[PDB]
Design a protein around this ligand. Structure first.
Ligand SMILES: Cc1cc2ccccc2nc1-c1ccc2c(c1)CC[C@H](C)N2C(=O)c1ccc(O)cc1O
Ligand SMILES: CC(C)c1ccc(COc2ccc(CC(=O)NCCN)cc2Cl)cc1
Ligand SMILES: [Cl-]
Ligand SMILES: [Cl-]
Ligand SMILES: [Cl-]
Ligand SMILES: [Cl-]
Length: 336
């Protein structure tokens, strides 16, 4: 086989970050999407695969890692087939879309698969701070890499099968996504607890006092994050007030500035002490025999962040920081 040679070849290129703008303007440009995707997916696959291989033989040789490594090898090769094919042959295009689908389905379970490797490492070698910083370093990178691959793939398969441009909404109403995510979390909250905090939403459009706040974003990434946040805020609120009557609302604010769009979600669930806040974001210290960390990645992915600060004995605030302008929303990608 050729795999390690290909990996070596394509790992000399640097993956290429795109912006929301460049992502929009892509969506008949199917020849052009293809000729781009056939270089770039291998680049991105090569690069992360190269980094998997820098892991110590004690990690590298465990079943989890070796399995997901087998998926990446097949996906690379799967796309190799197409390096010398013909962009003008409308059935070459037709069967590449099929090929991307099969790849997206080969990888659906990397999250819980890798989670197994964390779990085995944890009982196999220990949960020390140094192990943990490396797991953290590796997984933020790997999962961020993966997020971008799916972004590429979803943009192609959705556009090449009028308002939304595949997974991007160029007029995303942020309150709307807030309410939806809330409704859904509230549904689960009512099932498992038979009580649930209300929602208040206020907007602050700096430049434009009374216009509803819209942006260019990938709404499902935003739903993902809001949803996680609402689950956490509901849990704490409900459970901190079991012996008590009153049940405080979850208060969200959506602020729109010159460069940030920010979303705060304040609760009164009684908080977390400063010392325990880092762990909530740790893959290792929160795996036990998508999550905060992964929500944060989604924010980081287009130059955003997702930050927690608590007041122990009162509650927790959670901010999602996003770039307001499409021009500032550019993929954050790791490189070998
Ligand atoms: C993040 C998380 C995942 C869980 C998964 C399974 C079971 C319980 C869980 N609980 C949490 C969870 C949620 C809120 C909080 C904590 C843990 C630690 C204790 C504390 C009361 N707490 C918070 O203050 C808190 C944390 C994140 C957040 O977005 C909102 C919050 O109100
Ligand atoms: C499941 C996957 C995500 C996983 C599980 C576990 C790990 C852990 O990897 C470690 C653990 C400890 C050290 C310190 C050290 O002293 N190293 C010696 C040099 N080799 C380095 C690394 Cl890369 C990574 C990835
Ligand atoms: Cl993911
Ligand atoms: Cl729940
Ligand atoms: Cl933080
Ligand atoms: Cl290095």
């Amino acid at each position: 086989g050729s795999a390690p040679k290909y990996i070596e070849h394509f790992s000399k290129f640097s993956p290429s970050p795109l912006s929301m703008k460049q992502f929009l303007d892509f969506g008949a440009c199917e020849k052009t999407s293809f000729t781009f995707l056939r270089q770039e997916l291998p680049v991105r696959l090569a690069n992360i695969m190269k980094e998997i291989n820098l892991l110590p033989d004690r990690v590298l040789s465990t079943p989890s890692v070796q399995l997901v490594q087998s998926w990446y090898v097949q996906s690379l090769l799967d796309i190799m087939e197409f390096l010398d094919k013909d962009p003008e042959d409308h059935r070459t295009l037709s069967q590449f879309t099929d090929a991307l689908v099969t790849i997206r389905n080969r990888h659906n379970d990397v999250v819980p698969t890798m989670a197994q490797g964390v779990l085995e490492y944890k009982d196999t070698y220990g949960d020390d701070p140094v192990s943990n910083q490396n797991i953290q370093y590796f997984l933020d990178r790997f999962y961020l890499s993966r997020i971008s691959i799916r972004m590429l793939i979803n943009q192609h398969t959705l556009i090449f099968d009028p308002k939304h441009i595949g997974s991007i909404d160029p007029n995303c109403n942020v309150s709307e996504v807030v309410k939806d995510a809330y409704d859904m979390a509230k549904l689960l909250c009512d099932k498992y607890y038979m009580a649930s905090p209300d929602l208040e939403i206020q907007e602050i459009n700096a430049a434009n006092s009374k216009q509803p706040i819209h942006m260019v974003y990938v709404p499902s990434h935003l739903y993902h994050m809001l949803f996680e946040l609402f689950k956490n805020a509901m849990r704490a609120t409900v459970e901190s007030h079991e012996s008590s009557l009153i049940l405080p609302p979850i208060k969200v604010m959506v602020a729109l500035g010159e460069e940030d769009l920010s979303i705060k979600m304040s609760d009164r669930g009684g908080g977390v002490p400063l010392r325990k806040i880092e762990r909530l974001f740790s893959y290792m210290y929160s795996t036990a025999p998508y999550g905060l960390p992964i929500s944060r990645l989604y924010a980081k992915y287009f130059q955003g962040d997702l930050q927690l600060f608590s007041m122990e004995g009162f509650g927790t605030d959670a901010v999602i920081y996003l770039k307001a302008l499409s021009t500032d929303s550019v993929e954050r990608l790791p490189v070998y």
